[model samples]
Target chain A: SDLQKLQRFSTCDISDGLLNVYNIPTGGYFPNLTAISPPQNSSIVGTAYTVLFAPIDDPRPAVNYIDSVPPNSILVLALEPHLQSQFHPFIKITQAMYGGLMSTRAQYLKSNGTVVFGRIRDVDEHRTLNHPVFAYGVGSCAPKAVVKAVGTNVQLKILTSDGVTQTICPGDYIAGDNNGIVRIPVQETDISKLVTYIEKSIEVDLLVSEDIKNGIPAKQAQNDRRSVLKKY
Target chain B: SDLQKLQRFSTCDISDGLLNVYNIPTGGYFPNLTAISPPQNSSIVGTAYTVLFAPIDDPRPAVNYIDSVPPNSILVLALEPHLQSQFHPFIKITQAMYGGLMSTRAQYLKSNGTVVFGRIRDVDEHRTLNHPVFAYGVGSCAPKAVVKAVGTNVQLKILTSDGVTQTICPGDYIAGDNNGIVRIPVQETDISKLVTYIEKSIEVDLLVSEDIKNGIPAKQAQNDRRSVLKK
Candidate 1:
């Protein structure tokens, strides 16, 4: 069963559900960030929804988009290259893209939380909701004054370091917690399989840690589980 | 001037306002713990606030009481019978006495946080606020379903293991963070001085840790700090 499970990974793309079973090690900073790693012991898995917004060319469109956030989804507010550079976003206005009240609304809508490529305000509100939030930084202003929702579930380009900037599509799964966040490509049919691997990894870790604690040399303890890992 | 700018300690009848700064050493199911006694390097300080609540006869009168908690206070919800054997307060329920939404409301009203001689929900929510909270245990059930907020600022009775318990009143400071919770008595005016002494003790700890890292013997480095401590 385990080998058959590993076989499923042979041709599968990363899924948000897969991420739920894995945890990213490197803190996932939005700009120019890749080649990052996952945390050693963590679970990274969740559904992903996309929130595509553009600089407000007009007021009506932005409000309409913000009002249309779907339920039970993670909102990915993708700002543009002009808005996202090397840690220096383009929208240089005093307004913020996300705020506390928006989060309250989002929670009421049953969204997991939000991942903002830009900034957000109301740091305390997120805590109150027990919602996980990942953002570039903090802000005091609200998005209504500056940013307006223009698109949803659309393909958006995220600008970063010249070679490393990437795009995140809608329907991909994204997992985040206090440790960090990770993106999983949707459409892979290996959700259960991934959970199996993660669980096995945790089991091996328990054994290895036990060995070390019981006076087994760290090297030997690691060696004991190395073969099992290769099986995956 | 900063020294005299005193931040009113949360309800003195409860636990003393104590600061606990610690990194999660090994994150796991935070041990089934009642109280964590920090390493000797850390100090534990808090005074008790004793409160005794009248038993709920109709439940309506009692529920009205908790809803009207005072300002700048640390509400302590205790079920009577401080002795371990008396843990099951004859008139109390086992579910959480407080919840996350209430903490949000409390912190907003500047009531600091709370210590539940009982269980609480929304553990992650509490951690998010960095608002201090402590409890006797954990539970997933909601408090509203099982209990009534009958009294405003009613005294709480806490039961401990081995058949002993304590009563916490209002106007007492309850201080705890990741380090652990300790109750300091309100009448102790010398507490502000003790607070200063403890803060200095922590400062010496920083240098002591560094010295040990630099290969100085632990005992010798400790003695050096102890001498400064004595002075």
Candidate 2:
């Protein structure tokens, strides 16, 4: 329903709509991640079913995050920050935290796709499956010995480029394409209004693109088209 | 001629060949870069047309690096390190240093593709045109306001993960695919032998993959297949 309607918009459109039209502060953009599977054309849009990992020993029973993904959900994976002195939030790139087997399970469960904040393996397998997978980078080794699934369907806190914390909760909408991933927080927001704004923004940008093609400066075209947003 | 022959092999194949056979110390990989246009199936193999940029005032006359691309060339773009003190060579992410217009110019010049060490804009145009592009990140702002093209046909120095300097020189072979870009230095190297070894490596890997399909462990199959390389 709402997820399906939200799926019609790209991450870029959603990001612009949330930031510009809604004045929402965050949780709509992901930088530095790339699409590895199905080339650049694949896109993922579904409710987030988040999983968190950490370098410390896991005391709880192991969870198969991929196989347990609910239908119409996107598996958003990330890592817990280890030491305060650590250089990076992610695990070592030499170890792959996700792989083809996980993709196989997610697809079988009818999950939308996977968005990994860490490295992944079986680059060729995911490509062969034509599955949509996004990651910070690629690695060859399995991550079993290095990290553990510490939490599931929980809020995943990610540090943005400006060192601010952004949260992706269980029901948040996740969208990813060649550009990158963007999360739309589902709590306490009008989904229909968001979608309408995005649609109108997209319509206006089409004119802006035409202006650009007609040799109009981008700033002027953007200003001229986006001037309509003031009426809202 | 040679570029066409080299185009037959993927960057992954060349990388393995260079490391396993030649015992090359460096990976020659432009890591953290991905093909943004023409999809993953598209491959680019050509000599490099290198350019370097910096977030400073440029004294020399501006040269449009894209318009100057020669045939059978891949534009290798990078940033200049302002100081040995700087942690990264790139400018802040707010500015996108390259865009669709540059791709149009490169495509018109028959250049194979582009590899940028920094951010880019107009991601849709490149994809629509099916022009292959590789970069570390993406942005929406134009870079001309923040950075200047300082040099062309000059060696681009990229600092690797280990903090070691790697060079991309003019006329060096540049090959890229879904995996990533690999640079082959031009001076005093056995080009034919390198390609031959790459072909053999691909052959061995095929057999290894088949063995893997037969339930042999990946390590065992790899060791068995690559044993031929040792002898």
Best by TM-score: 2
Docking class of 2: incorrect
TM-score, per-candidate, Cα-based = 0.42, 0.59
Candidate with top lDDT is 2
lDDT of 2 by residue, B16-135 (tens): 767866677665776667566744455788899999887556676555565577877898888775421112223334345677657766666677889888777668778887878887
How do the residues B26-120 of candidate 1 rate in per-residue lDDT, one tens digit apiece?
A: 21011122321121222222322222333344345544333344455665665544212332212233334555545555455455556666555
lDDT of candidate 2 vs native? 0.73
Candidate 1 positional error at A170, Å: 1.6
lDDT of 2 at B89: 20
Which sections of candidate 1 miss by over 4 Å?
A1-45, A58-60, A88-94, A160-163, B1-231
